[model samples]
Target: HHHHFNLPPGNYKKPKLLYCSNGGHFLRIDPNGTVDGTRDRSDQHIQLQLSAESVGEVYIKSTETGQYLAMDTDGLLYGSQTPNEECLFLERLEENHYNTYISKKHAEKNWFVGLKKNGSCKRGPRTHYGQKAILFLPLPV
Candidate 1:
């Protein structure tokens, strides 16, 4: 089942997540098939795009366009030929809640972490599992 909600206007963007398997490298491609330079997975080539709409509030449009990276329990990172390749599409579950169409196999495996924008020039690691990673909707100034 799917649910929907509303949000107040605010500036938001999705943050990126990096991943690795067995200390190896990986890379993430955008929906448009371009590798996002904003995301650096050099140490571990796994890159992720959190789509502008996928951040912050639940009901926003995504500005991103590309495939993303995921991992399995055995530390194997998976890549998609197309965006949402694994069929794990992002969905707004509620006002401040969202969910992804992650595979049951992947969801049960792999350690995941996220990052969030702090301000114009700063970002911080997501301290918890459930937190807004981006805020695409802009509120009135």
Candidate 2:
């Protein structure tokens, strides 16, 4: 998923740390609180992309569960619910990473992110592994 920041009129700049894995992409916004893009360099825009294979099971499981959270596939962790029915569609951010779009339904809640490996073969001890990264953004109060 992509995050777009619409800055108010005026110059703004900010610094950010990008995180990604073979299975997903993410962006973290770090501001100096100046809100001045030109002077304080506290306002800026950033874009990120993740990568992954087709939206198929990277592992043998039908859905994400248990310790699978530790796997390298990039995904949004949803509450206990039916498969395919509640699962959200993920977008490729890079070669093997993926991400979920923010949903209006769960705007008040928090979500978890995970990553997966890439390749046509099933995930196993010998399958190619991908890197994993995580970023947490606090919602404005």
Candidate 3:
């Protein structure tokens, strides 16, 4: 049985824009594998494909660059050519009406996909659930 996790409807085929709650920035990736935030909601780089790996896990891929969102041991977010453990994230909808993506492989370390208040990438180890910087809202494109 396949579960759609917490993602909203119409996201199955359409690309989505992930808006970070803290900095009002949208998650974006570059062709050079750089992952960061952008204020431009219509930016093509902000469009992402969300693929399900399991009931609660997902793989976030860049539609433009075709790169998977990945995180390393240092908690730095980047784009990867292949889907690996670092690319798997547990997607959850929090009580605050936002979503959070925690690194499935590094859950023990409490690694969350987060961006700073200035829209800069934040290291996972420095992030936590209560932090607004780690909260994201997925919008349909």
Candidate 4:
């Protein structure tokens, strides 16, 4: 289901890169549903090959795993089949001007899909405001 949301009105077409705020590592939706960091900085899997869904929605798919970045309200992210609400997220910007992908799982609450130290992606509380709570940024591209 495509849920309507608002975007910061930037270059949504801008080349997308998935970076973890914690380690500053590149992310990959591993085949094992392990949302971990890519082996190398130039790892292809870390690059986001987005599939547009609705007007303001898109799916961050895994090139190697063929999975979509998905997660629950717990902030644990994984790769999976077609996006349910949990798998869907709103790609928007923050006051800092960097991009953020907020989980659609608990649309009412603020669930951010962030990164763990080991490169595992998880669902976290927006209020956490830690490095793990952020998950998106633009590559120099």
Candidate 5:
């Protein structure tokens, strides 16, 4: 069942541990910008920041690697040392605080962030949302 709650006033965001429902893994980014899993650990959390008027847009990064999660022009998802436009992502909230992360390049596009069974991350077509598309569970900080 889905429960509802409201956020307090002012600019606020929370860092969370995104758990993949498919393989029960936590998403993490490598030094080379490769997105992967980091097993069970609180150190692998991802922090999202937002401004007063910002909606949908969020900047994500690996707490352990300290790298920005970004998607290249090629639509390849990865981690980067520097933050840029490609590093921005839009949060699509599903039921019960669940989330699906989409690229900032386009709205309602075909691509969405997903995780492979092998513990690697990639972008998949939104049409395949039922398949490997990342269904992230956000654990509030």
Candidate 6:
């Protein structure tokens, strides 16, 4: 029933770690309302729940923070307590077996969820579809 992204129909069979291809960091959220990348896998705070809202759209929520991954107009990544337009991301699987999540709210501007080599969040305008910083591997745990 689900062959679009080659993923299972409903939610994922297991939680996933949003591993960045560039810095080898895992996307993580803090209860203090901060979003960053981590190389550590021992923290459950890094586990993510990807729920499909449409054919190629998804809402990335944190199981630990109970918040949705959101992007600001300025391309800043943050956690929102409620699901809104900013929380919508267009999920695309690249030929390299990596995934790219572009903010649906700012897709026209090419705002992608990216991280720097230092594990800092990369702004939207600085991102592109072919960049390694924007590539993520949704590895199941």
The TM-score of predicted model 3 comes to 0.90
Residue-wise lDDT of candidate 3 within 1-141, one digit each (tens)?
Answer: 122256433344777899997989999988899989999876889999998877668899999988999999889999999989899998887753788888888887778999988889999999986898889988887
Better of 1 and 4 by TM-score: 4
| Clashes (N, CA, C under 3 Å) per candidate | 22, 34, 0, 7, 1, 0
Per-residue lDDT value at 139 in model 5: 55
Cα-based lDDT at residue 50, candidate 3:
93
With a 3 Å backbone cut-off (N, CA, C), the pairs that clash in candidate 3 are: none
- What TM-score do all the candidates reach, one by one? 0.27, 0.20, 0.90, 0.74, 0.72, 0.89
| Predicted candidate 1 versus true structure: per-residue lDDT over 1-120, tens digit per residue | 122224333233434333222122222344543332233334222223444334331221122333344333443334445444232423233235323222323333312222234221
lDDT of 2 by residue, 19-106 (tens): 2333322222223211001112222321211222234111111111211111222223322222232233222232222322222222
What's the lDDT for all of these models? 0.30, 0.24, 0.85, 0.63, 0.61, 0.83
> Compared with the true structure, what per-residue lDDT tens digits does model 4 show for residues 19-90?
666667676765567777653766656656665576556677765656788876466777786667667877
Q: Which is better, 1 or 6, measured by lDDT?
A: 6
Q: Judge candidate 5 against the unseen true structure and give its global Cα lDDT, from 0 to 1.
A: 0.61
Which candidate has the highest TM-score of all? 3
The TM-score that candidate 4 achieves is: 0.74
Question: Clashing residue pairs in candidate 5, if any?
Answer: 33-79
Model 3 lowest lDDT segment of ten = 1-10
Which has the higher lDDT value, candidate number 3 or candidate number 5? 3
